[PDB]
Scaffold this active site. Structure first.
Site, PDB file in Angstrom:
ATOM      1  CE1 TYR A 116      -3.332  -2.793   0.426  1.00  0.00           C
ATOM      2  CE2 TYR A 116      -3.500  -2.279   2.763  1.00  0.00           C
ATOM      3  CZ  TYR A 116      -3.870  -3.054   1.677  1.00  0.00           C
ATOM      4  OH  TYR A 116      -4.787  -4.045   1.848  1.00  0.00           O
ATOM      5  CB  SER A 120     -15.397   4.532   5.629  1.00  0.00           C
ATOM      6  OG  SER A 120     -16.072   3.296   5.858  1.00  0.00           O
ATOM      7  CB  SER A 144      -3.667 -12.194   2.250  1.00  0.00           C
ATOM      8  OG  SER A 144      -4.763 -11.463   1.715  1.00  0.00           O
ATOM      9  CG  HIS A 202      -0.844  -8.534   0.351  1.00  0.00           C
ATOM     10  ND1 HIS A 202      -0.602  -7.175   0.365  1.00  0.00           N
ATOM     11  CD2 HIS A 202      -2.188  -8.671   0.239  1.00  0.00           C
ATOM     12  CE1 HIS A 202      -1.753  -6.519   0.210  1.00  0.00           C
ATOM     13  NE2 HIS A 202      -2.730  -7.409   0.124  1.00  0.00           N
TER      14      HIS A 202
END
Length: 307
Positions: free
Chosen positions: A61, A255, A153, A119
């Site tokens: 990220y 969010s 993941s 990941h």
């Protein structure tokens, strides 16, 4: 009151993750640049969101600076934060999990992460480590206390079995894309994971709402969601997030807005009936799969996804 899953090693994990640092406001013609907007919303979450705040971060990220800043400036105690971080196997940034976590801890200004994941099973060709060796590295990171829990993941049943074949410590978590429109990211992963006591996390559980077809108002999935929303006086997102929990899976959501983050943390203020859970499941399964992640790899599993 906040709920937790208990992992196979006895450790507790907050049963919703409400804060992610994978998504930021991003220009079309974009920049690996600092998102002040992101560090702000993280800081605000840590200050105002009640209970243990579960954060989802990842090497790939490239937002450790933003998260690091928030972690430094907040007065939220370390013990009331659950940090998940992920070794970037798909796109090489570090040589291996141990060098990645060291970098992450240093940027983040923390001594340990609460959960450390591989990941992706699709290891970058430039890595000089394979899955088995990478797992054994997580096992040692666990041993050292730098990761309090370890898992994976986006793993298929086949990937999991490769780990289980050499594992001293069983993966505690498999973070998959899961939603009512993708109830098996890859074939049989949900049943296999839950049968082997590997907690699923669900990334993009709000996929139905992220990607809302134009005829949604005549669609019974969306009509039922609105009904439950009105019954409980909760948002549609809250209902979907609670649903994931009732399927025994940990919803991982994010969010742009603090109101939405607080609502996510507050999903345990109501409860769905078994009948309601089953209807969401069934109306979901009738829908064509929506897949937002690992799309190039796992499109080929779309036919098994709602099966």
């Amino acid at each position: 009151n906040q709920k937790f899953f208990t992992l196979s090693n006895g450790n507790k994990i907050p049963a919703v993750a409400v804060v992610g640092v994978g998504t930021k406001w991003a220009h079309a013609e974009e920049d690996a640049t600092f998102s002040q907007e992101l560090t702000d919303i993280v800081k605000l979450s840590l200050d105002t969101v009640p209970g243990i705040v579960h954060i989802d971060a990842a090497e790939m990220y490239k937002t450790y600076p933003e998260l690091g800043a928030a972690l430094k400036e907040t007065k939220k105690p370390r013990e009331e934060i659950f940090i998940t971080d992920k070794f970037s196997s798909l796109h090489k940034i570090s040589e291996d999990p141990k060098s990645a976590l060291e970098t992450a801890l240093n940027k983040l200004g923390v001594d340990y992460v609460d959960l450390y994941l591989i990941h992706s099973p699709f290891f970058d060709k430039d890595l000089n480590i394979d899955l088995e060796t990478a797992w054994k590295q997580l096992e040692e990171l666990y041993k050292s206390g730098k990761a309090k829990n370890i898992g994976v993941s986006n793993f298929t049943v086949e990937d999991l079995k490769k780990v289980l074949a050499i594992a001293e410590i069983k993966p505690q978590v498999n973070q998959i894309e899961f939603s009512p429109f993708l109830q098996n990211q890859t074939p049989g992963i949900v049943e296999f994971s839950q049968k082997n006591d590997i907690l699923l996390e669900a990334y993009s559980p709000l996929g139905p709402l992220a990607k809302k077809p134009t005829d949604a108002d005549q669609q019974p999935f969306y009509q039922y969601l609105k009904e439950l929303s009105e019954k409980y006086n909760k948002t549609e997102a809250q209902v979907l997030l609670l649903w994931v929990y009732k399927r025994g899976i940990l919803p991982v959501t994010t969010s742009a807005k603090i109101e939405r983050i607080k609502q996510a943390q507050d999903i345990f203020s109501f409860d769905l009936t078994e009948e309601e859970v089953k209807k969401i499941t069934d109306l979901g399964l009738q829908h064509e799969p929506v897949r937002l992640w690992h799309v190039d790899f796992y499109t080929k599993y779309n036919s098994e996804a709602q099966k």
